[PDB]
Design a protein around this motif. Structure first.
Motif, PDB file in Angstrom:
ATOM      1  N   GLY A 136      16.335  -8.456  11.411  1.00  0.00           N
ATOM      2  CA  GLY A 136      17.653  -8.780  10.908  1.00  0.00           C
ATOM      3  C   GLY A 136      18.854  -8.920  11.809  1.00  0.00           C
ATOM      4  O   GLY A 136      18.765  -8.926  13.038  1.00  0.00           O
ATOM      5  N   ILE A 137      19.999  -9.023  11.146  1.00  0.00           N
ATOM      6  CA  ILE A 137      21.287  -9.202  11.789  1.00  0.00           C
ATOM      7  C   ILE A 137      21.644  -8.111  12.811  1.00  0.00           C
ATOM      8  O   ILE A 137      22.335  -8.385  13.796  1.00  0.00           O
ATOM      9  N   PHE A 138      21.153  -6.889  12.595  1.00  0.00           N
ATOM     10  CA  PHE A 138      21.435  -5.788  13.516  1.00  0.00           C
ATOM     11  C   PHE A 138      20.231  -5.442  14.374  1.00  0.00           C
ATOM     12  O   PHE A 138      20.280  -4.512  15.176  1.00  0.00           O
ATOM     13  N   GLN A 139      19.145  -6.184  14.191  1.00  0.00           N
ATOM     14  CA  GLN A 139      17.937  -5.958  14.969  1.00  0.00           C
ATOM     15  C   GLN A 139      17.480  -4.501  14.942  1.00  0.00           C
ATOM     16  O   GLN A 139      17.409  -3.839  15.980  1.00  0.00           O
ATOM     17  N   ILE A 140      17.167  -4.014  13.745  1.00  0.00           N
ATOM     18  CA  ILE A 140      16.704  -2.642  13.547  1.00  0.00           C
ATOM     19  C   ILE A 140      15.189  -2.581  13.775  1.00  0.00           C
ATOM     20  O   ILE A 140      14.435  -3.386  13.225  1.00  0.00           O
ATOM     21  N   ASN A 141      14.762  -1.618  14.591  1.00  0.00           N
ATOM     22  CA  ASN A 141      13.360  -1.451  14.982  1.00  0.00           C
ATOM     23  C   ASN A 141      12.379  -0.851  13.970  1.00  0.00           C
ATOM     24  O   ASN A 141      12.657   0.160  13.324  1.00  0.00           O
ATOM     25  N   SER A 142      11.207  -1.478  13.879  1.00  0.00           N
ATOM     26  CA  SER A 142      10.147  -1.071  12.958  1.00  0.00           C
ATOM     27  C   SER A 142       9.380   0.185  13.362  1.00  0.00           C
ATOM     28  O   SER A 142       8.554   0.687  12.599  1.00  0.00           O
ATOM     29  N   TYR A 172      10.925   3.123  14.334  1.00  0.00           N
ATOM     30  CA  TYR A 172      11.651   4.303  13.877  1.00  0.00           C
ATOM     31  C   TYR A 172      12.370   4.227  12.537  1.00  0.00           C
ATOM     32  O   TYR A 172      12.469   5.233  11.828  1.00  0.00           O
ATOM     33  N   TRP A 173      12.848   3.040  12.176  1.00  0.00           N
ATOM     34  CA  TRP A 173      13.651   2.896  10.968  1.00  0.00           C
ATOM     35  C   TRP A 173      13.099   2.252   9.708  1.00  0.00           C
ATOM     36  O   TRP A 173      13.347   2.743   8.610  1.00  0.00           O
ATOM     37  N   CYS A 174      12.389   1.144   9.841  1.00  0.00           N
ATOM     38  CA  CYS A 174      11.838   0.499   8.657  1.00  0.00           C
ATOM     39  C   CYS A 174      10.335   0.327   8.797  1.00  0.00           C
ATOM     40  O   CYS A 174       9.785   0.388   9.898  1.00  0.00           O
ATOM     41  N   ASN A 175       9.664   0.120   7.675  1.00  0.00           N
ATOM     42  CA  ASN A 175       8.224  -0.040   7.706  1.00  0.00           C
ATOM     43  C   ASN A 175       7.803  -1.493   7.525  1.00  0.00           C
ATOM     44  O   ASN A 175       8.195  -2.134   6.552  1.00  0.00           O
ATOM     45  N   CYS A 217      20.999   1.144   6.102  1.00  0.00           N
ATOM     46  CA  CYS A 217      20.067   1.655   7.101  1.00  0.00           C
ATOM     47  C   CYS A 217      20.791   1.817   8.443  1.00  0.00           C
ATOM     48  O   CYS A 217      20.580   2.793   9.160  1.00  0.00           O
ATOM     49  N   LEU A 218      21.647   0.857   8.768  1.00  0.00           N
ATOM     50  CA  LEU A 218      22.414   0.902  10.006  1.00  0.00           C
ATOM     51  C   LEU A 218      23.215   2.203  10.055  1.00  0.00           C
ATOM     52  O   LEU A 218      23.284   2.868  11.090  1.00  0.00           O
ATOM     53  N   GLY A 258       2.611   4.333  15.072  1.00  0.00           N
ATOM     54  CA  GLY A 258       3.587   5.401  15.208  1.00  0.00           C
ATOM     55  C   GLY A 258       4.895   5.174  14.473  1.00  0.00           C
ATOM     56  O   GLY A 258       5.935   5.691  14.881  1.00  0.00           O
ATOM     57  N   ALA A 259       4.854   4.405  13.391  1.00  0.00           N
ATOM     58  CA  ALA A 259       6.058   4.130  12.621  1.00  0.00           C
ATOM     59  C   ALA A 259       6.526   5.378  11.869  1.00  0.00           C
ATOM     60  O   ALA A 259       5.719   6.099  11.278  1.00  0.00           O
ATOM     61  N   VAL A 260       7.835   5.617  11.890  1.00  0.00           N
ATOM     62  CA  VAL A 260       8.446   6.774  11.229  1.00  0.00           C
ATOM     63  C   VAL A 260       9.169   6.432   9.910  1.00  0.00           C
ATOM     64  O   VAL A 260       9.280   7.280   9.022  1.00  0.00           O
ATOM     65  N   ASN A 261       9.662   5.200   9.792  1.00  0.00           N
ATOM     66  CA  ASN A 261      10.368   4.744   8.588  1.00  0.00           C
ATOM     67  C   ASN A 261      11.493   5.683   8.151  1.00  0.00           C
ATOM     68  O   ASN A 261      11.564   6.076   6.987  1.00  0.00           O
ATOM     69  N   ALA A 262      12.385   6.017   9.080  1.00  0.00           N
ATOM     70  CA  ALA A 262      13.491   6.928   8.788  1.00  0.00           C
ATOM     71  C   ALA A 262      14.451   6.422   7.716  1.00  0.00           C
ATOM     72  O   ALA A 262      15.129   7.217   7.071  1.00  0.00           O
ATOM     73  N   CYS A 263      14.519   5.108   7.520  1.00  0.00           N
ATOM     74  CA  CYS A 263      15.399   4.555   6.497  1.00  0.00           C
ATOM     75  C   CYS A 263      14.707   4.492   5.132  1.00  0.00           C
ATOM     76  O   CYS A 263      15.354   4.215   4.122  1.00  0.00           O
ATOM     77  N   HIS A 264      13.401   4.768   5.105  1.00  0.00           N
ATOM     78  CA  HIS A 264      12.616   4.712   3.866  1.00  0.00           C
ATOM     79  C   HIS A 264      12.842   3.342   3.242  1.00  0.00           C
ATOM     80  O   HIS A 264      13.188   3.219   2.063  1.00  0.00           O
ATOM     81  N   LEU A 265      12.630   2.311   4.054  1.00  0.00           N
ATOM     82  CA  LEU A 265      12.865   0.936   3.635  1.00  0.00           C
ATOM     83  C   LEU A 265      11.879  -0.032   4.271  1.00  0.00           C
ATOM     84  O   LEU A 265      11.572   0.077   5.456  1.00  0.00           O
TER      85      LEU A 265
END
Length: 130
Positions: free
Chosen positions: A55-61, A63-66, A95-96, A72-79
């Motif tokens: 996306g627009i903010f380039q959030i990494n898969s 640690y943050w999204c699945n 999420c940001l 080793g994905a963590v999905n901290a945003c539960h998204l």
């Protein structure tokens, strides 16, 4: 969707990003610009760790999204990462806000550190009436 400068500025302000955790709207704009060029469909696959920035903010898969494809994905945003590829950035912004609550804050993005940090960023919100 590729947002026009001021259109994005107004959207981010409306979503409460101006001053979020002390970071000005112009800084968030600078981040979006150098990370994705204001494009909500931008994705960057990193062959090194097999993770992808979404996306627009380039959030990494990793640690943050699945996205179901990164080890080793963590999905901290539960998204699901696919929600970060929508024209409506409401989900991405939520999420940001979680991402920057970590110790590094906005300094997590190398491009922001290299092109925005400590520099004049007033240009990103000039003439947007925000």
């Amino acid at each position: 969707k590729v947002f026009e400068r001021c259109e994005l500025a107004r959207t981010l302000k409306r979503l409460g990003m101006d001053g979020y955790r002390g970071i000005s709207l112009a800084n968030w704009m600078c981040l979006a610009k150098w990370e994705s060029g204001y494009n909500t469909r931008a994705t960057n696959y990193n062959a090194g760790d097999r993770s992808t920035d979404y996306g627009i903010f380039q959030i990494n898969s990793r640690y943050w999204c699945n996205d179901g494809k990164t080890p080793g994905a963590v999905n901290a945003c539960h998204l699901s990462c696919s929600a970060l590829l929508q024209d409506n950035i409401a989900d991405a912004v939520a999420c940001l806000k979680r991402v920057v609550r970590d110790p590094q804050g906005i300094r997590a993005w190398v491009a922001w550190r290299n092109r925005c940090q400590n520099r004049d960023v007033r240009q990103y919100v000039q003439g947007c009436g925000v």
